[PDB]
Each structure stands twice: as C-alpha cells, then as structure tokens.
Amino acid sequence: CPLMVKVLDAVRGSPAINVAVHVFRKAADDTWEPFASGKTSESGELHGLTTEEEFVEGIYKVEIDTKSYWKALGISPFHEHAEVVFTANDSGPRRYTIAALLSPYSYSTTAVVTNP
Amino acid sequence: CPLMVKVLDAVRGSPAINVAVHVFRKAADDTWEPFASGKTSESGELHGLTTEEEFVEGIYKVEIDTKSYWKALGISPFHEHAEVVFTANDSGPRRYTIAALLSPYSYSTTAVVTNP
Amino acid sequence: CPLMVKVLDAVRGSPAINVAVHVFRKAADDTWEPFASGKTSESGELHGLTTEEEFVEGIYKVEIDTKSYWKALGISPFHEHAEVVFTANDSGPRRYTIAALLSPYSYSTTAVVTNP
Amino acid sequence: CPLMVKVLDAVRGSPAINVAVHVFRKAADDTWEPFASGKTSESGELHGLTTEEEFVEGIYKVEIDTKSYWKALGISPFHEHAEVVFTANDSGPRRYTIAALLSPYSYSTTAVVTNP
Ligand SMILES: [Cu+2]
Ligand SMILES: [Cu+2]
Ligand SMILES: [Cu+2]
Ligand SMILES: [Cu+2]
Ligand SMILES: [Cu+2]
Ligand SMILES: [Cu+2]
C-alpha cells in the first residue's frame, strides 16, 4: 500500500475495528470526487485502498465514520467524523499512513509520509 | 457566548491569531445555512459568535481556516481547512468550546461541553 | 497567574474538577524543591499557583493527580499520575498554560507560552 | 514482542528515528526499577524490549527522551520527555503498544492492548 489508514480507540485501548473509511480526491471542478472506501480490520488497519499507479499527486480527504462506531458501542459522541486533508506526491511517489486516535469528544489525526 | 473557538499552534506553543472561523447550521431542507463567523483574537479565541436566544438545538458545522495565520509566519505553503460537525443543545442549553491544535502533519480537536 | 493548569476529560467532554496539582522547582543541588500546589476548580483550571515575583527562571515540574476526579465518577480503578518537566522564563518572563486531556488509555498534554 | 513502542514526529510527518526509550517497572519498595531501553529504528519502532516470560504483571513507566531528539534537529522543545504509565497483565498475557505523537510543545501517548 501507498495508502494506509489506522484507527485507535482511546476509551478501550484497542484498535478501532470495522470503522467505515471514505477517501475523496479533489477534482478539477474543485469538488470532492470519491476515490476509495473500506472498513478497518481486527488490527484497526485499512490497506488496499489504492495502487501506486492510481494514487497520483493531488489533494485528498480521508473521512472516518466515527459516529456509527461510537453508537455501535452505546456512546453518543460529539463528532460526526474524523477528517484529515493532505496533499499527496508533490515530490513524487511515497508511502502514506493516516493514523487516527478517537475518543467520544476528541480526536487526532496524523499523516506519516515515508520514502521506501 | 455559548459557543467559543480556541486555536493553538503545537510547534510554536502559541495561540493562533486571525484564524477565520465560519459556523453553519443544518436547515429543514438539509442545506447548510450560514450561522456565524469571526476571527480569532490575540489569545487564539473567538467569542461573541452567538447568543443563547439564537443558539437553538440543531446540527452545526464549525470550519476553521488557518491561511492568514500561516501566511504571516512566512509559512505560505502549509495551511489548514478543518471542520467539525456536531449536535448542539439536544438535552437543553450547553456552553460549547471547540479547541483545535495545529501542526504541519497533525491535527487534534477537542470539545468541551458544560452546563451553567 | 503566570502559571496555569487546565485538565479536561476526553470521554465526557468535561473539565476535570478537583485534580490535585503539585509544582516543583529544581534547586542548586539538583533536588526538586516544592514550589506550589492546588486543586482544579469547576472549570478544570487552577490559577493562583504563583506570582511573577516568585516565578523566576528555572526548571519546573508539574504533577497532576486525577484520583479524586475518577473516584467521584465511580471509576475507582483507573486514575492518572502525569508529570511535565520544563524550563521557564529562560528568555525573560512568560505566561505558561499547561493543558492535559485525559482518557482511559491515552493522555495528551500541551503547553501554551505567551508574552504580555 | 509483547511490548512495542512507536514514535511519530508531527512536524516532519515521519516516524521519529533514533529516539532513546527507557522502560521502568515499579518495584516492591515502591521505586522505579529499570526494565529495558532502546532506540527507535528507521520506522520509528522499538521491538525486542522484553520477552513474554520477563514482562510480568505490574506498573510500568515508558520514558521517551524527546528533548535530545528535538535538539538534534535544531529545535528547543518544551518537554524533557514524553512519559506514559500503564498497568500490565492484570488479566494475564497481552501484546502492548505504546504509541507516541510528538511536537515541540505537545505530545500524546496511547497504550494499545491486543489479545492474540
Ligand atoms: Cu460519513
Ligand atoms: Cu428551510
Ligand atoms: Cu484555503
Ligand atoms: Cu540548594
Ligand atoms: Cu495515586
Ligand atoms: Cu531521560
């Protein structure tokens, strides 16, 4: 993968399992175009979103559907989503990991960029 | 001020001054109606977005735009568009503080909800 | 108050009330001398730890103890001992705010340094 | 590994490479006893700190030497360390990952516990 998402749950101290993730890419008309989506695995990871050939230079939006996650567990959270926007491949091809840490009233997101 | 926004820069341990903030409210037809807007002061806060008379039950979006903040540091390239969507006053009136913590590859946001 | 502590609970999106805070200052012999202590108020803040006359250049430790906070929620088991160590006023006097964000398996802390 | 540490740099959007990590275990006399230490790899990970047989029930302290890290890069940070305290194996044997996100004025730490 050049693009991985990883989601952690701060309440339970576990990976967030089975969370919906939607990735969008900013188009020429200046809207968000759907790019990929998936659900996190037992380990809280989502691999296989794209190929290197399909993950070109651009602006991407990762949208994690955290409200459904917290409601599945009986908790009414604050946010609808955890979002993060990043700019890809301005200097060509790279591994990208979007790490997200969730709690009912707070979250953080991080983009890690690695040249293998 | 039942609604307040505070923005901080985690590299420089400073308030983020002149961050544009826009707030929207979901209408009956499911479009986003404009609700309030402002800039963060010297202490990174924005108060006076609304009154309790106008801040009714609903679904609200707060968008922060950090462009002016970065530009004036002489960091033109990186800047942030961040958004939270939440449900307000569903169990009666509350004071909301939306706090955001910025960094070049990471973003955190937290919400503090009290009852006076 | 050139030194302030703010504690927030990220599960409940609330201030943490009655958190004991202790502050220490490194002495000439490299032992930690007691400097100040207090409890967080209703809004999760502690002010009045010191004056600018007493808050001189030095290396300071701030310890937060969340036991009373958890106990009163009926969460006895989990509680936190957290500590930050930092250098204060090295380039002249500054106001410091040490903010902490608690959760069962995660902890965040941030420092905001301004110059009045 | 039943114990891994993972450190990320929020400024550069990379793993934190070559950071010193010290792990302590709380002893019977109620002091911190040294348990293990190591440096993060190219990927920001430290594996091999212990065996399952040696990582028994107890209270552990992970101390990341972040000040040296930031100074290596030319930045005068706020904190001396990123710390985290956790309780291990109260319910027997588990994989533990201590994830840390660093910036010069803020950090977060998370303990992830997984039953393989
Ligand atoms: Cu959605
Ligand atoms: Cu309408
Ligand atoms: Cu813009
Ligand atoms: Cu002395
Ligand atoms: Cu204690
Ligand atoms: Cu050390």
Report CA-CA distances (Å) from B3 to A34, B93, C45, D57, D74.
33, 11, 19, 45, 39
- Nearest ligand, CA of residue B22? 3
Give the method of determination: X-ray
Question: Is the CB of residue B102 less than 8 Å from the CB of residue B9?
Answer: yes
Question: Is the CB of residue A23 less than 8 Å from the CB of residue A63?
Answer: yes
* Beta pairing partners, A33: A25
Contact at CB, A114 and D8, closer than 8 angstroms = no
- Nearest ligand, CA of residue D63? 6
Report CA-CA distances (Å) from A98 to A8, A42, A88, B76, D36.
11, 17, 12, 23, 30
Structure tokens at A75: 């908790």
**What residues sit around ligand 4, an ion, with C-beta below 5 angstroms?**
C 27-29
Contact at CB, A15 and D99, closer than 8 angstroms = no
Question: Is the CB of residue B115 less than 8 Å from the CB of residue B94?
Answer: yes
Distance from CA of D41 to the nearest CA of B (A): 20
Which DSSP string do the residues of D21-84 spell out, in sequence order? EEEEEE-TTSSEEEEEEEE--TTSEE--S--TTT--SEEEEEEE-HHHHHHHTT---SBS-EEE
Report CA-CA distances (Å) from C63 to B92, B116, D24, D51.
36, 29, 18, 32
The residue extents of the domains of chain A are 1-116
One-letter identity of residue B64: I
Distance from CA of C42 to the nearest CA of D (A): 24
> Is beta strand B95-103 parallel, antiparallel or unpaired with respect to B3-9?
parallel
Rounded to 5°, angle at Cα D12 from D64 and B108: 75
| First vs last C-alpha separation in chain D | 11
* Beta pairing partners, C98: C5, C111
Residues A47 and A65: their CA atoms lie apart, in Å, by 17
Which of helix, strand or coil describes residue B62? strand
- Asked if C32 has any chain D CB less than 8 Å from its own CB, the reply is no
| A11 closest CB neighbour out of C11, C13, C101 | C11
Residues A89 and D54: their CA atoms lie apart, in Å, by 44
**CB burial class (10 A; 0-12, 13-18, 19+) of residue A29?**
exposed
Question: Is the CB of residue D49 less than 8 Å from the CB of residue D20?
Answer: no
- Asked if A106 has any chain C CB less than 8 Å from its own CB, the reply is yes
Contact at CB, D106 and B13, closer than 8 angstroms = yes
Closest CA to C56 of C113, C112, C2, C116: C2
User: Alpha helix locations (H) across B13-112?
Assistant: 67-73
All residues of chain C having their beta carbon less than 8 Å from the beta carbon of residue D30 are none
Residues C113 and A38: their CA atoms lie apart, in Å, by 41
Structure tokens at B84: 């939270």
Sign of CA dihedral D100, D80, D105, B113: positive
Residues C96 and C50: their CA atoms lie apart, in Å, by 11
CB atoms under 10 Å from CB of D34, counted, come to: 10
Report CA-CA distances (Å) from B79 to B67, C115, D28, D73.
5, 24, 51, 23
Distance from CA of D79 to the nearest CA of A (A): 20
All residues of chain D having their beta carbon less than 8 Å from the beta carbon of residue C26 are none
Largest CA distance in chain A: 44
Question: Is the CB of residue D8 less than 8 Å from the CB of residue D14?
Answer: yes
Closest residue of chain B to D101, computed from CA coordinates: B106
How far is the centre of ligand 1, averaged over its atoms, from the C-alpha of B105 (Å)?
23
B17, containing H or E segment:
none
Closest CA to A102 of D15, B36, D99: D99
Contact at CB, D103 and B106, closer than 8 angstroms = yes
Structure tokens at A103: 């709690």
In whole angstroms, what separates CA B1 from the centre of its chain? 13
CB atoms under 10 Å from CB of B33, counted, come to: 11
Residues D49 and D36: their CA atoms lie apart, in Å, by 6
Contact at CB, A110 and D101, closer than 8 angstroms = yes
Binding residues of B: 6, 45, 108
Which DSSP string do the residues of chain A spell out, in sequence order? --EEEEEEETTTTEEPPS-EEEEEEE-TTSSEEEEEEEE--TTSEE--S--TTT--SEEEEEEE-HHHHHHHTT---SBS-EEEEEEE-TTS--EEEEEEEEETTEEEEEEEEE--
Question: Is the CB of residue D58 less than 8 Å from the CB of residue D88?
Answer: yes
How far is the centre of ligand 4, averaged over its atoms, from the C-alpha of C88 (Å)?
18
Question: Is the CB of residue D9 less than 8 Å from the CB of residue D102?
Answer: yes
> Is beta strand A32-39 parallel, antiparallel or unpaired with respect to C3-9?
unpaired
Which DSSP string do the residues of C31-54 spell out, in sequence order? -EEEEEEEE--TTSEE--S--TTT
* Beta pairing partners, C14: C9
All residues of chain A having their beta carbon less than 8 Å from the beta carbon of residue C102 are none
Question: Is the CB of residue D8 less than 8 Å from the CB of residue A112?
Answer: yes
Token look-up 């109606």 returns B33
Contact at CB, A10 and C105, closer than 8 angstroms = yes
Torsion of CA B106, B5, B90, C71, to 10 degrees: 70
- Backbone angles phi and psi of C34, in degrees to 5: -60, 140
Question: Is the CB of residue D22 less than 8 Å from the CB of residue D34?
Answer: yes
Question: Chain C to chain D, count of Cβ pairs less than 8 Å apart?
Answer: 42
One-letter identity of residue D111: A
CB proximity list for B2: less than 8 A, separation 6 or greater: B50, B51, B52, B55, B93, B94, B95, B96
Closest residue of chain B to C108, computed from CA coordinates: B108
* Beta pairing partners, A82: A64
- Asked if B111 has any chain A CB less than 8 Å from its own CB, the reply is yes
Resolution (A): 2.5
> Is beta strand C45-46 parallel, antiparallel or unpaired with respect to C3-9?
antiparallel
Which of helix, strand or coil describes residue D16? coil
Q: How many CA atoms lie within 13 A of D102 on its CB side?
A: 29
Rounded to 5°, angle at Cα A100 from A51 and D91: 115
Give one word for D58, left, alpha or beta, with left for phi > 0 and alpha for psi -120 to 50: left
Closest residue of chain B to C109, computed from CA coordinates: B10
DSSP C90: B
All residues of chain C having their beta carbon less than 8 Å from the beta carbon of residue B106 are none
Question: Is the CB of residue D98 less than 8 Å from the CB of residue D109?
Answer: yes
CB proximity list for C114: less than 8 A, separation 6 or greater: B14, B15, B43, C94, C95
